[PDB]
Design a binder for these strands. Structure first.
Lengths: 96, 59, 206, 79, 114, 127, 98
RNA sequence: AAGAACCUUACCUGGUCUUGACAUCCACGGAAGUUUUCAGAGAUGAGAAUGUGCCUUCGGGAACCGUGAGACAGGUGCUGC
RNA sequence: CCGGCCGGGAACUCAAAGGAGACUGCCAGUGAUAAACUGGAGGAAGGUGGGGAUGACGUCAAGUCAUCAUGGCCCUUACGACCAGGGCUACACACGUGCUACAAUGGCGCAUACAAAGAGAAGCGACCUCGCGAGAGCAAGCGGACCUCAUAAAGUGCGUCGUAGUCCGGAUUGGAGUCUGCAACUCGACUCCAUGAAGUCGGAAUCGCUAGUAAUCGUGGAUCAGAAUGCCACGGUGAAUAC
């Protein structure tokens, strides 16, 4: 299921991380001016998916859009499955 | 002075230290930290260690 | 529905963690995704090898995978060629040097995941579920576990209305924490539907 | 409501507006982008803002300079 | 000390008497407060011409009262005269800043009617 | 002994010095009067500092650690009881009878799931 | 001066490892500081158990990073020769500092 | 839903489909790639400059890229009765 | 340097490993000579010490085919797939949940106290300079008991207000800094300067809570480029009453 969304997410991560984010960083440090603008217009010309803010974090096992936990890298249900199974190291039921 | 010039990215291997016969690639060096940041594999375990030329004797 | 996973509630007290490494926040998700891919390749390649548990322990640079298997001969193969192909495979999935070691599961009728996949494969091959479950519980009670409880669920015997049938012998004290209870679940994709098999085996009180 | 480092306009809109001024007369310039501030170069031109399948024609006056294209397009329909 | 309002200070604060005068926000009050630097709840008897001239020049230097009524009324009016939707959507009275209208906005919409 | 602080109440462990003479509380080399002299609830928490009755021939310097003011007073009170037991074991019966030797194990409860506070529950609609 | 910092998810593992490093320092004979207990960093994760609508139904989780510093006072070439793979525990992450 | 400005994100417009955004094959060609130019609301086209390294028991092999037919993909489509 | 700061020391707080301890163990009275009950000594804790995790067989064909897997059915030049602008944020209204209120046990101003728990590398960002400010510039220390978020607020001590619709602060577009510049128009939060509504303690009804509880006051985290009054955690003060 939802295989197109994972393909889309792959594309945004690939455009943002590898192709760009040297050019975009140089454009942003020019774009903030300190003593219509050409750097803003060039940043418009750069593709939209190159923005890091277009990446939506997805579960690595299921691709769920919501509920992601970034330390584990998985959504809550897969995290609970792996914690109950033992695949997540050091994770146990907290009882304080 | 032996090897008084210091070159970033130069690979030195210490046979006496635990890092012998180990190969690693340094993608990032933290110049703002002012300490050399290499993910040095120590005891067969790869972890980032801050390092200095005065701290470790160059091979 | 209302029951906690025995391994999860016992993961520090009695049962051991399957994956044993230290990772900070940068390496945690990458290590875990590599682990899921390593376990998935090892399961699908060793579907006939009677796999029980996959234990992944890594000293950051290297990865060590210990497969607990009822039959070491099929996974070892001819002079370690099969194990070497899996070693190269785990190295390419992990991106780091791999080492695969093999633990023998003596008494496979006591191991939870093995009896789970036995009942699952039987249900796929159209063995009657009462017969398969009764064979499992009597084999475990014979080989010396203190108790076995086997629960089957869903679409039993090609019926439209789903049912959950549980056969119980001996003790499964699930509420007590000392009890070493290996619990596992296997999934049978039968032609009429999905049949889920749940096994608890209480081997002793630790 | 925006940074004073730079005013904002779409680059295709800036190109199309400067070509419209260089022509000196233009029909409605159909712009799909609504997030563009009106320039003083826009005054005297007809910019056609997209709001779904309806097509709104907005003619610039001298008041509507700091404002974006979007507020002169109705997004939703009410009784 | 009445300059461009209906309210004259009456043994009360100049800054809240101007604040009760419409069309003026708090910062002009704050500036005249910093200019004064006494208690303003002192009496209004011997109203000071120094206070009258300072408040008049300060409200004149900043945004003058009545431009608020001008801004709402002429923004509605000229975009009505053009026929653009912004005058109508500012005219209907529902809040355009972004507030929810599904269950709230009764300040703009008055008491409820079924 | 030097009458150092001991004894705990809530999240406080006591750091007080008490020494013979006349008594005036000074905190961080600064006065109780400059800091919090005419404070209300400070009499309420100064009373347990003296409830141990071991102030009558002494001087007080207080720079206790942890908690808030009443918890700090509880820790200081428990500490002067401990100092009293360590100095002479004779008044143990009277200190236990007054109830001072008991460590107040009352501590704040954790926030629980489905409950806005420790016991307070979200408002329930029957329909 | 050479301070070694050890982090683990298992306290039995980190006690066994800190004993192995302390015994190695004792076998060389240079002065060592003790296994100094630095506070456990506990991370609490509260995840919803039901896939669909049940807000109150949640389960709690903790990861405990146990930590110990051993701080060898005098470095020795015999130690540095013996340090290679001295920990031999996958759970224990070891960071030395000069 | 532990997070709707775009993305997320299904529902109106412009382009695309027998290999589809996404895998596996088969054929042919090209290293992969990087820098730009024009058009467009834009993946989309239409172009130029450099890179054929890496290698094959060279009767040439890669991760790949693009096209061309079929199996196939793909579905947040239906039924938690 | 009157700053544990610094020699020192490890004595306390403390950290985190291992133990000790609480079992109606002891004594009395009752009971049936039993289980047990009611008191008492000791003790830090006394009779599940407090709280958490732990939800038996089943029930409602309860909820999820939209986390994922899945039987059957359907689409496959469209029910697949890409893009741009839109909607999920509209509003004649009616319910359920929380915030801030209706002041004086409170506001406003100044000065001063005492915490816990977390997080942090494309991150936390001191310090200094410049801004009324949100912030900006320059930028050390930090993958952490070290550096940073981060001078807790209720409390207090002096004034001042003693009806003021009060700093209760709601209200269209104005003047701005930030996020990402696909990009704050629809549709961000923020000192915003916008105008100072409603409300003078709330009809029938109805809900939470038995002690560090309710109430009240702040702090942190996940989600996250930005976007809590929600959720999940943390401590400060601290009741009333059970015949």
């Amino acid at each position: 299921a939802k295989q197109s969304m994972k393909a889309r997410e792959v594309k945004r991560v690939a455009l943002a991380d590898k192709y760009f984010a040297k050019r975009a960083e140089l454009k942003a440090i020019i774009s903030d001016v300190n003593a219509r603008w050409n750097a803003v217009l060039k940043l418009q010309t750069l593709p939209r998916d190159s923005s890091p803010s277009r990446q939506r974090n997805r579960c690595r096992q299921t691709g769920r859009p919501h509920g992601f936990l970034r330390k584990f890298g998985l959504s809550r249900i897969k995290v609970r499955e792996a914690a109950m199974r033992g695949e997540i190291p050091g994770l146990k039921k907290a009882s304080w | 002075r032996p090897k008084t010039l210091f070159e970033p990215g130069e690979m030195v291997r210490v046979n006496d230290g635990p890092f012998a016969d180990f190969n690693g690639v340094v993608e990032e060096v933290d110049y703002e930290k002012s300490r050399l940041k290499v993910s040095v594999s120590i005891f067969g375990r790869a972890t980032p260690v801050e390092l200095d030329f005065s701290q470790v004797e160059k091979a | 529905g209302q029951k906690v996973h025995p391994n999860g509630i016992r993961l520090g007290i009695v049962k051991p963690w399957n994956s044993t490494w230290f990772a900070n926040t940068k390496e945690f998700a990458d290590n875990l995704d590599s682990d899921f891919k390593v376990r998935q390749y090892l399961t699908k390649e060793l579907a006939k090898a009677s796999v029980s548990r996959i234990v992944i322990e890594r000293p950051a640079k290297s990865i060590r995978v210990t497969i607990h298997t009822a039959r070491p001969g099929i996974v070892i193969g001819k002079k370690g060629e099969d194990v070497e192909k899996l070693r190269k495979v785990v190295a390419d999935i992990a991106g780091v040097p791999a080492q695969i070691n093999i633990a023998e599961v003596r008494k496979p009728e006591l191991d939870a995941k093995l009896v789970a996949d036995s009942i699952t494969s039987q249900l796929e091959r159209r063995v009657m579920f009462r017969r398969a479950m009764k064979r499992a519980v009597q084999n475990a009670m014979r080989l010396g576990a203190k108790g076995i409880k086997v629960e089957v669920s869903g679409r039993l015997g090609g019926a439209e209305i789903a049912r959950t049938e549980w056969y119980r012998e001996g003790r499964v004290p699930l509420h007590t924490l000392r009890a070493d209870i290996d619990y596992n679940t296997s999934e049978a994709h039968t032609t009429y539907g999905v049949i889920g098999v749940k096994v608890w085996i209480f081997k002793g009180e630790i | 409501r925006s940074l004073k480092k730079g005013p904002f306009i779409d680059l295709h809109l800036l190109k199309k507006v400067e070509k419209a001024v260089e022509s000196g007369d233009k029909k409605p310039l159909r712009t799909w982008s609504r997030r563009s501030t009106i320039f003083p170069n826009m005054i005297g031109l007809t910019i056609a803002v997209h709001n779904g399948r309806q097509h709104v024609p907005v003619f610039v006056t001298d008041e509507m300079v700091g404002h974006k294209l979007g507020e002169f397009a109705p997004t939703r329909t009410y009784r | 000390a009445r300059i461009a309002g209906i309210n004259i200070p009456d043994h009360k604060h100049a800054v809240i008497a101007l604040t009760s005068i419409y069309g003026v926000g708090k910062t002009r009050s704050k500036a005249i407060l910093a200019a004064a630097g006494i208690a303003e709840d002192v009496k209004i008897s011997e109203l000071s011409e120094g206070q009258i001239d300072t408040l008049r020049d300060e409200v004149a230097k900043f945004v003058v009262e009545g431009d608020l009524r001008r801004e709402i009324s002429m923004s509605i009016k000229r975009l009505m005269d053009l026929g653009c939707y912004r005058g109508l959507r500012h005219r209907r009275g529902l809040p355009v800043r972004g507030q929810r209208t599904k269950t709230n906005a009764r300040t703009r919409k008055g008491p409820r009617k079924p | 002994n030097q009458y150092y602080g001991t004894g705990r109440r809530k999240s406080s462990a006591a750091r007080v010095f008490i020494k013979p003479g006349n008594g005036k509380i000074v905190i961080n080399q600064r006065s109780l009067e400059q800091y919090f002299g005419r404070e209300t609830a400070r009499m309420v928490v100064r009373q347990p500092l003296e409830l141990v009755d071991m102030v009558e021939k002494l001087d007080l310097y207080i720079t206790v650690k942890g908690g808030g003011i009443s918890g700090q007073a509880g820790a200081i009170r428990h500490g002067i009881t401990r100092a009293l037991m360590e100095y002479d074991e004779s008044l143990r019966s009277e200190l236990r009878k007054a109830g001072f030797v008991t460590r107040d194990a009352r501590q704040v409860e954790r926030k629980k799931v489905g409950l806005r506070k420790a016991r307070r529950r979200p408002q329930f609609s029957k329909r | 001066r050479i301070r070694i910092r050890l982090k683990a998810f298992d306290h039995r593992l980190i006690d066994q490892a800190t004993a192995e490093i302390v015994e190695t320092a004792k076998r060389t004979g240079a002065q060592v500081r003790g296994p100094i207990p630095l506070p456990t960093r506990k991370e609490r994760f509260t995840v919803l158990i039901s896939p669909h609508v049940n807000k109150d139904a949640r389960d709690q989780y903790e990861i405990r990073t146990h930590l110990r510093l051993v701080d060898i006072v005098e470095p020795t070439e015999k130690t540095v020769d013996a340090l290679m793979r001295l920990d031999l525990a996958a759970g224990v992450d070891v960071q030395i500092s000069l």
